Amino acid sequence: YKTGLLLIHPAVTTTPELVENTKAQAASKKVKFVDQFLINKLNDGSITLENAKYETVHYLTPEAQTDIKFPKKLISVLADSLKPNGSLIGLSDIYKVDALINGFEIINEPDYCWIKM
Numbered sequence: 001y002k003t004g005l006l007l008i009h010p011a012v013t014t015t016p017e018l019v020e021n022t023k024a025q026a027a028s029k030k031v032k033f034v035d036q037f038l039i040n041k042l043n044d045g046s047i048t049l050e051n052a053k054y055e056t057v058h059y060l061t062p063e064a065q066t067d068i069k070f071p072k073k074l075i076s077v078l079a080d081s082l083k084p085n086g087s088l089i090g091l092s093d094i095y096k097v098d099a100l101i102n103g104f105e106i107i108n109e110p111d112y113c114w115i116k117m
Contacts, residue, residue: 004035005054007042
């Protein structure tokens with residue numbers, strides 16, 4: 001069974017629907033998400049939980065606005081909590097070059113992510 005991460009921006013995910021869905025996908029399979037990081041509370045410094053076994057990552061932010069999403073410094077802090085089979089289910093087009101330089105390996109298998117080694 002797998003121990004992972006769910007990382008959420010509150011705007012769509014403060015109602016129960018996206019939270020129940022990510023939990024439904026994990027639950028009918030064999031993952032459970034344990035560690036809940038909000039975008040404003042992680043950037044402020046409230047949640048520091050482990051530096052190791054979350055090696056399955058989901059980022060649910062709303063993707064209908066065309067504005068910019070995430071800082072590079074939090075991608076380096078998120079990578080520091082993982083191991084060579086880290087597997088990100090996240091981040092889009094600018095983040096391709098960001099995955100390259102931070103040490104992620106971007107695999108396009110249509111849950112589109114990045115597996116850090």
